[PDB]
Amino acid sequence: YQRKIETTYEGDPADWRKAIGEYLLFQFGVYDDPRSTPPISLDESGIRYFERQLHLAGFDEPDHPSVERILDIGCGWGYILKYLADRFPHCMRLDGVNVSREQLEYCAQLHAKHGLEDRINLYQCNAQDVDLLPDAATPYDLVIIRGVISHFPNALYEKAMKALYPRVRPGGSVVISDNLYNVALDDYRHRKTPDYFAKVLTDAGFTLHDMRVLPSNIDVARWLMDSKANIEKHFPQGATGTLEELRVLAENWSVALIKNKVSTYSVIVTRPAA
Ligand SMILES: Nc1ncnc2c1ncn2[C@@H]1O[C@H](CSCC[C@H](N)C(=O)O)[C@@H](O)[C@H]1O
Ligand code: NA
Ligand code: NA
């Protein structure tokens, strides 16, 4: 299982920057932010989407909880952790978990470029093993799971949430983005529905704060077709590996989004007080 994930994300980050943007954010974007000046890049749409999730989780309210420890589960190429270090300058502990050694090497380089290595800790760790993270005595105020659970089988997703719940502070937020199938059954010719997806979280003990389609189907399609155009512009001789797979997937996934067969969801849950 884990070797397949490692193979998927082992490619040169410089090639990925040409495909998905300089920030290497890989869970779509929003094209509706009044602060965005068109044309809207993948970097811009991705960050504005993440900012909208933090807004929906209550972090623009002046009396939100003090963000003292952060976890990013499946932290990709590390820009969400960089953004969060800038967003919460008083947060002196941000932890990233990832199975991809190539992505973690890039994360360490990005964080070192910004002098963030004393605030951001990196762990080569499966999501199911978050119970192994150091200092259980300091719970997490904010946990990010951005485009990761779609890579998990149902047993792994349930096991990971069971491991995560004790590590979240009461009143702390888990801010999730994932790619779901809108209906349980489609014509014959890691599938999760919204009801199933939310029930894993509430069964684990979390309380729903907000769940909605975000980005919109047409915004996810825009992100995919802009990434496809980037790959075709920057690899005119032909793409290889995961970037060729993304180029092909962009059209098929965009069609499914236009037909409303699949959507991307923002899912925010909190740990309740005992
Ligand atoms: N079981 C697992 N445990 C930890 N990380 C996992 C995982 N399965 C997938 N991943 C990681 O999940 C990420 C999916 S891509 C999304 C990356 C990042 N969160 C972003 O929003 O840009 C990759 O970093 C991949 O290596
Ligand atoms: Na390159
Ligand atoms: Na690896």
Whether 177 is in the pocket of ligand 1, judged by its Cβ within 6 Å, is no
Q: How far away, in angstroms, is 248 Cα from ligand 1 center?
A: 21
Whether 78 is in the pocket of ligand 1, judged by its Cβ within 6 Å, is no
Q: Which residue has the tokens 């270090």?
A: 85
Q: How far apart are CA 20 and CA 233, in angstroms?
A: 12
Q: What is the number of H-type helices and E-type strands within the chain? A: 9, 7
Residue 173, both tokens? 């937020």
CB atoms near residue 229 (< 10 Å)? 12
How far is residue 196 CA from its own chain's centroid?
A: 19
Nearest to 175 by CA among 150, 131, 203, 208: 208
* Domains delineated in the chain: 2-270 (3.40.50.150)
SS3 assignment, position 106: helix
Q: How far away, in angstroms, is 239 Cα from ligand 2 center?
A: 11
Q: How far away, in angstroms, is 133 Cα from ligand 3 center?
A: 19
Asked whether 100 and 123 are in contact (CB, 8 A), the reply is no
SS3 assignment, position 64: coil
Asked whether 128 and 163 are in contact (CB, 8 A), the reply is yes
β-pairing verdict for 262-270 and 120-124? unpaired
Helix (H) or strand (E) holding 6: helix 2-8
Whether 97 is in the pocket of ligand 1, judged by its Cβ within 6 Å, is yes
Q: How far apart are CA 72 and CA 175, in angstroms?
A: 10
Cα atoms found within 13 Å of the Cα of residue 162, Cβ hemisphere only? 7
Nearest to 72 by CA among 130, 127, 145, 126: 145
Instruction: Please indicate the experimental technique that yielded this structure.
Output: X-ray
> Which ligand approaches the C-alpha of residue 164 most closely?
1
Helix (H) or strand (E) holding 44: helix 42-56
Q: Which residue has the tokens 């512009």?
A: 233
**Angle at alpha carbon of residue 190, lines to 186 and 191, rounded to 5°:** 25
Whether 21 is in the pocket of ligand 1, judged by its Cβ within 6 Å, is no
Q: How far away, in angstroms, is 236 Cα from ligand 2 center?
A: 13
Helix 101-113 to helix 79-87 angle, to the nearest 10 degrees? 30
Asked whether 56 and 142 are in contact (CB, 8 A), the reply is no
Q: How far away, in angstroms, is 262 Cα from ligand 1 center?
A: 20
- In the sheet that holds 207-213, the strands lie side by side as 120-124, 94-98, 70-73, 140-146, 168-181, 262-270, 207-213
Helix 79-87 to helix 42-56 angle, to the nearest 10 degrees? 50
Q: How far apart are CA 245 and CA 236, in angstroms?
A: 15
Q: How far apart are CA 30 and CA 214, in angstroms?
A: 8
Q: What is the 3-state secondary structure (H, E, C) of the chain?
A: CHHHHHHHCCCCHHHHHHHHCCCCCCCCCCCCCCCCCCCCCHHHHHHHHHHHHHHHCCCCCCCCCCCCCEEEECCCCCHHHHHHHHHCCCCCCEEEEECCHHHHHHHHHHHHHCCCCCCEEEEECCHHHHHHCCCCCCCEEEEEEECCHHHCCHHHHHHHHHHHHHHEEEEEEEEEEEEEECCCCCCCCCCCCHHHHHHHHHHHCCEEEEEEECCCHHHHHHHHHHHHHHHHHHCCCCCCHHHHHHHHHHHHHHHHHHCCCEEEEEEEEECCCC
Whether 23 is in the pocket of ligand 1, judged by its Cβ within 6 Å, is no
Rounded to 5 degrees, φ, ψ at 240 are -130, 170
Q: Which residue has the tokens 């044309």?
A: 39
266, β-bridge pairs: 177, 212
Whether 122 is in the pocket of ligand 1, judged by its Cβ within 6 Å, is no
